[PDB]
RNA sequence: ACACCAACGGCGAAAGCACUCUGCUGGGCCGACACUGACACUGAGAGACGAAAGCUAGGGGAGCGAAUGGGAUUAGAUACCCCAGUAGUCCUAGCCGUAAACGAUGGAUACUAGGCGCUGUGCGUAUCGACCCGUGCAGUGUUGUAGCUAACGCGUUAAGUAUCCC
């Protein structure tokens, strides 16, 4: 379906399973466990973005516009 | 040797008080020879039955 | 005083003394012996000695009410564990069952620290 | 109520046969050595210590025999 | 054959006061059965073993103030499919009534040893 | 606070985590090509977590128990022992950021005998389901060859042979 491996589809993976850990951080803060593994998470989708941007600008800015992912750090 | 062919659970309970002692206490590993997967679920079961008081800590 | 056939003979022993006290099922106290009551103090108190006399001392007066069969009870880590259950024996009394009651937490308080001796 | 040690004494009663049926009785539960052990406090260290010792005290014993 | 669709396996087990009729116990069973059905349940099986000696004594206050002492004891066993989210309030239902002494609930996991 | 289970056993980044259960969730590992195609490793600054004691505010207070008091012991005893016993230990919301926070061993990768063990899975065999055997991985434990070391020792989980960053 797609490509499960593609990039953009990567990025799309982390980011919605990061917007869903977001509730459950929400509601238990006492979590860190959790919270550890979402700023893991959230490192290894910042990264293929980084690569993304290096790789293709294109599609990076597409995917980040469209993914509604905030604005890149190197500014 | 032995072995266990039927599912373990709380309610078989000829097969927990085979593994417990006579003062109900749990028999450890080494003796009841069970694979460490066995004996943890074992374990559970015996304090799950204990709870539901078809076996007994104390006894009487 | 009270003449019952059937009753019950608790024996606590600690490491500073042994209580043996004798009782009947409704869970009622006839009469005790104590090790101390026995013109015995402080070291004596513990041996096996003194829980011997204790406990023949008790079935003097459990006869004297003209009792027969007992069970017994024991309670504590002390020396008169042993010690007592012979002069319970020896007394001529109809041994039924004996058990240890000696209670065991199964987790709790926390115990006072060790002595540093 | 409740018991740990449950010794029944028949009518063939005679008091050696008796007072060591129940002192193996006792070593059996080891309740004894266990208020020793709960006498006093003991961090994890000397707990520790203790299945160590013991364990492979009564283990070994298991090994060699 | 048993096939959840989208919900969790479950076994719970309730124990009741031996004093109870076939009645008030078929009424407990409705009840409850009620309860799980109304919370999504597809497939509720329900099933009885009743009277049986306690391993131990066991204490319930009645909402009458009675202090209840058992010996025997009621099991009722439950395999049910219920969402993960409607068992939480299940559990409680049970521990507030009065005829209901003794409940527990297991989730079942398939058996690989 | 969680006896037995408990084990020279399990997970965790470390701190740590154990009566039972349910629910929300973090990782791990394994087998298949299903896919992308170097997206890697490390990390100055910076951030998060971080035993216990401690502190602020509100609760809670059984046991234990600094401080404190009595009793002894002693030349003395502001200690050891005994009898009492307040903070604190517990919970909620925060601060503190230190420990022999120890494997006294930064991280990643490659490569170099074995023997005996365990935990997870996978394969073939054994029966057609439990073993059983041999094996493939992933971690974990004990002896030990080469080599290393001032010795002790370390030895595929290196303190070996090399490369990179702190
Ligand atoms: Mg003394
Ligand atoms: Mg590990
Ligand atoms: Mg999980
Ligand atoms: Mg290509
Ligand atoms: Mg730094
Ligand atoms: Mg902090
Ligand atoms: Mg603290
Ligand atoms: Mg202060
Ligand atoms: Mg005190
Ligand atoms: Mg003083
Ligand atoms: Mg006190
Ligand atoms: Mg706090
Ligand atoms: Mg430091
Ligand atoms: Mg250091
Ligand atoms: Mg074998
Ligand atoms: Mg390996
Ligand atoms: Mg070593
Ligand atoms: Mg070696
Ligand atoms: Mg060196």
Known sequence: ?75 | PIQSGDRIDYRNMSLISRFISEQGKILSRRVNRLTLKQQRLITSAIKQARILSLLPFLNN | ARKIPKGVIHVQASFNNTIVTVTDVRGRVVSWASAGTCGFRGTKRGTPFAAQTAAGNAIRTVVEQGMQRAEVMIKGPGLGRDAALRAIRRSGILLSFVRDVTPMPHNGCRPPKKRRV | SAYNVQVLVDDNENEERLLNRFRREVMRAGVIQECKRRRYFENKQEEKKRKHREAAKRNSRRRRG | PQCPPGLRQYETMAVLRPDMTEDERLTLTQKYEELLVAGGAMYVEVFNRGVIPLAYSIKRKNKAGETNNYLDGIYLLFTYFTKPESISPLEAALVTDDDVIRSSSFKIRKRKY
């Open chain 1, 1 to 75: 379906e797609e490509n499960k491996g593609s990039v953009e589809f990567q990025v799309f993976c982390f980011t919605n399973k990061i917007r869903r850990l977001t509730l459950h951080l929400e509601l238990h803060k006492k979590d860190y466990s959790s919270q550890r593994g979402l700023r893991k998470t959230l490192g290894k989708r910042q990264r293929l973005l980084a690569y993304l941007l290096k790789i293709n600008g294109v599609r990076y800015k597409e995917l980040i516009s469209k993914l509604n992912i905030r604005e890149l750090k190197t500014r």
